[PDB]
Amino acid sequence: GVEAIKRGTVIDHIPAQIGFKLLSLFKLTETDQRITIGLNLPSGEMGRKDLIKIENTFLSEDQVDQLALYAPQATVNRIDNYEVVGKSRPSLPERIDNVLVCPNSNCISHAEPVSSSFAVRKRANDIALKCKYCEKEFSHNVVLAN
Amino acid sequence: GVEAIKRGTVIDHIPAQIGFKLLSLFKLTETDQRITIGLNLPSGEMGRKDLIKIENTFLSEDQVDQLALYAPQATVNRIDNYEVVGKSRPSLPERIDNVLVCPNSNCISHAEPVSSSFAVRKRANDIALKCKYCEKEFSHNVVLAN
Amino acid sequence: ANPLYQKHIISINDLSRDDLNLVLATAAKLKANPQPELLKHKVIASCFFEASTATRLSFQTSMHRLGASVVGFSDSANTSLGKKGETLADTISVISTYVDAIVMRHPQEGAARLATEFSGNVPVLNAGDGSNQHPTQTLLDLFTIQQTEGRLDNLHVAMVGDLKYGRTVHSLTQALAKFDGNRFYFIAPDALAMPEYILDMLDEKGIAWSLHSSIEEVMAEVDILYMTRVQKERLDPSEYANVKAQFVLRASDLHNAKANMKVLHPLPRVDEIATDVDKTPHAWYFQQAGNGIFARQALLALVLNRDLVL
Amino acid sequence: ANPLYQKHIISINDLSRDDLNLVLATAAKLKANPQPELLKHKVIASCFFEASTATRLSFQTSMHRLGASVVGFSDSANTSLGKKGETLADTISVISTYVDAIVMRHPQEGAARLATEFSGNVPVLNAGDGSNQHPTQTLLDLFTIQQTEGRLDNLHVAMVGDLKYGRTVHSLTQALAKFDGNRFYFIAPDALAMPEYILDMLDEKGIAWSLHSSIEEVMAEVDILYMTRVQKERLDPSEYANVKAQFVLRASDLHNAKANMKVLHPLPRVDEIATDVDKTPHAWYFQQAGNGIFARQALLALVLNRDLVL
Amino acid sequence: ANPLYQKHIISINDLSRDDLNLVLATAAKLKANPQPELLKHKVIASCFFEASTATRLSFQTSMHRLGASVVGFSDSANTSLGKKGETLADTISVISTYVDAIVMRHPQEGAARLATEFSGNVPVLNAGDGSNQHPTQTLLDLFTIQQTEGRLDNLHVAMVGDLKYGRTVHSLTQALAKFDGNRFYFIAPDALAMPEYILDMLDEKGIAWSLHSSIEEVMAEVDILYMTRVQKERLDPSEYANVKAQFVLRASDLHNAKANMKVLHPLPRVDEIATDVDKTPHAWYFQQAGNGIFARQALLALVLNRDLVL
């Protein structure tokens, strides 16, 4: 596509203006081998599409379903020998630990040395996240706002 | 190498791990156009380069010069309908308005609505940066926030 | 081993209908036949990082009626957390090497859950964390409702006041949704309404609830009228319009209440219950406070004793 | 139009040897024979957002000794910036529609420089901006030096005290590095030493400067001993070790001082210049303070009158 | 004697369409050609018991631009009322024996009205009394409106922000209701809405006013968009929900504004007028601030000089 690799992952169908967020959010910059980023690529059905290619790397257990919460229709293509060895589409997990910040000012998660952790319920219109410590439940819009 | 382009700019020869910094710092990604970034891709000349093809956007001299504090030897290139019109290069820019933040905590620039501004001088070895307001002079490395 | 032995009582949410029923059955037994030695030689820490009179003194009287020992604080201004920057994680890590259970009240929501990550083998019992939960308030209110109503199912329960910051009603509603057929009436000013996650749960469960702008609307319908106090200390400045009680209960308004109906309140009360109510047969809030001794004795008895023969 | 006519006076860094010499010549002219109506019908703002006895009152006496009217404030607490959140930018935008020139002292470095961005054609005269510059201090310091040494070129000047935060030695070191063959001796604690950017500037201009650990080791070769006071208002907690004066001058140390050498101090002094020095021939700081009237009068005359005091 | 000669100027409610028109005509006369000695030998008191940058400094520049002398204070903390318990009544009684007229701003509503009870023949000019009136603000607001619209009759004027405590919109709404055929649009949060007594007055005079929930729904028909700032100093705790600006104007909203329409603001502004509006053609608040000098100069001229600036 816009580049090829012997082995690596290719995250395609990334929504626009989110592509650049993933290089920071997964720190795909602490790397030595090549990355190909194509931004605002046409995708006839979804117009704007960003796409990332990482040579020699495959996304870990975390990032794949953490990607579910960030680019719900992205398609992760595992490649080896230039063959699409696996294709994946992320599922929403039961929980997301470490990466999200509790919106509640008075949650102890903000003062003490502990990893944040939220439960993921896929609540009719949107994902609701319940914080493991203060027990409040929030719209994912709120929890992963920018 | 990497993906084709008709009209625009292609910033080649960016030193490794700096291509990212530049996408962010001068906001180059906040566009509705197609950018292709090749991170960590083999150069030869100085081992490994990083590089950005920004399609249908052209830089002024003034923008291009601002890159000299990061990528001094970068090679800007404008291609009007595929052929290379002008291959340019950064010269350090005399002033760097708006991009950096004064590390003096008591500088007035932090409270009021004015844009930041620094005078740039090759200070003998490092590039020194004097804030136009508090007049304190700083090495370019510290001004690039810690 | 009984189901509650060595459990952390952090949230009503983690308890089932039978854990709850086990506590009430035990509280009833110890209310009738006392056990002065049940916890002879256990030392229990009472750590109150936020103001309390009744929760702290009912808890340490319960410990003393069962032969236990108490060490602790009611004011974190003099701990090394207060003056030297000890984290709550290192505070709990150290205190768990000394004692057999930790009773804790703290101002940030989430504090007792955090304590359990550092606690080791020591059970942590939540005397209130910010505006989240107050589990031991619900075991004394459920013992009181059972005492007066002889039923914890099919009741008409009205909850009045600051329902957004009230940890007592967040825990009580979650517990009464475990029994069958309870009808809830929530009367609160908009700003201080029931948080949506409690409502979502009532709905997902098929429980009936409704909102009302007065108490008169529901006075003849209710079995329990649960009054709460505006949590001034938890309010945001934008909520300061809501500091004064919006719904005040006076003896006159008890005009056509069912005879069995009781007025419960976790206390302290400010202006929401006039003192003439105190002299009516409906006022049950100081008998309720008294029941804290049996509900808390029960919980301490069950968390630290494998099998209990009562 | 004379060279300084309507220029902003913000930093010594923007004035030439000639601009300084002009001010000085006009100071001597107006000291010799007055001009009471030179600025008749002008109204000048006195905007002191930071403490001042001498700079504000010598500036306002100069405005009054030339016929101008003064409006202003000495304290920001009752300005709309103090109580209402007005920005310094909107403050200068409104005051620029009223007065003929703006004198302002402010606690942040950079404050007079941004007033100019918003002041229109109204000149901004910097009465001290945080720890950056103080250009009118240097104009009276230079007038007093010229007046007691005859020259401004080929001097030995020692600067003692807090040179990191001393805005007076920032401007003055930059003014004397404009004349030829001046030698610099700097006596400060390491934590309050001269900022790199002034030493660099001394170096590319080829000026000879040196660090010294005592006043005594340079007492015999200096012509100007310019003493400063630790800027305690500006110190960080880290630096609180340096609140007391390390180098304190007593009259005995002057017993081998060059007979022309004078002791200057911008003032206030706290313990660094003992009061017995006050009675000795080398003491010139109150004379120095008085010369503020003539340099400030000259400066206002040049920035606001087209012509040139003959 | 001209009509305003020695009148107290306390509320717009006591001045006629003619009294306002007079002030305005004199403002244009004195803006066109100055009068430096019109108030020579008068001494005017500047008594600011509440914060001020613009009203105090534009008033004192006007007094100075007409030859008068100023005496006063900007802060009450070091007055004998501040430290000794002097009453405002005895304060005005003593100051009336010294000065030719008294300008005073004060935090209580009614303060300038009672100064007149104790000021003898010395006129009292109200520079703002609590949340009641601010008559000289309206005189420069009207001069700026007349100056940018040509008329004061038949305007569309929207007033946005805190209208409950905005003393500026109290006076200004009452001044424009003196001219014919002006339409009013009021955009405020319900808690900071126009006081009943001004709406009544609009109604018996048959004036058309309407409430609107956005600037955008009236942006195309307004000629004057007069923005105000929430009077946070004056808010009750109840009202603290309204401290942030609900209606914030950014330059994009002006992209369908009538080409003559100007944006006025008494100032200080905090978040309600974004700084990008500052560069657009509709922005007229700093021009407006400048016109304070001409209306205040005209007012002093009329109250203190018998004659009439020709």
Ligand SMILES: O=C(O)C[C@H](NC(=O)CP(=O)(O)O)C(=O)O
């Ligand atoms: O304070 C309240 O209103 C209810 C409740 N009160 C109690 O538990 C009684 P005390 O604060 O005396 O321990 C609480 O949630 O803290």
Ligand SMILES: O=C(O)C[C@H](NC(=O)CP(=O)(O)O)C(=O)O
């Ligand atoms: O304060 C000092 O030490 C030096 C200097 N002092 C003065 O200008 C005298 P004043 O603060 O009374 O106006 C200053 O920078 O403010």
Ligand SMILES: O=C(O)C[C@H](NC(=O)CP(=O)(O)O)C(=O)O
């Ligand atoms: O403060 C305001 O918002 C409006 C108005 N502002 C002014 O008059 C400007 P100042 O308070 O600087 O004199 C006032 O009523 O005081």
Ligand SMILES: [Zn+2]
């Ligand atoms: Zn949380």
Ligand SMILES: [Zn+2]
């Ligand atoms: Zn700066």
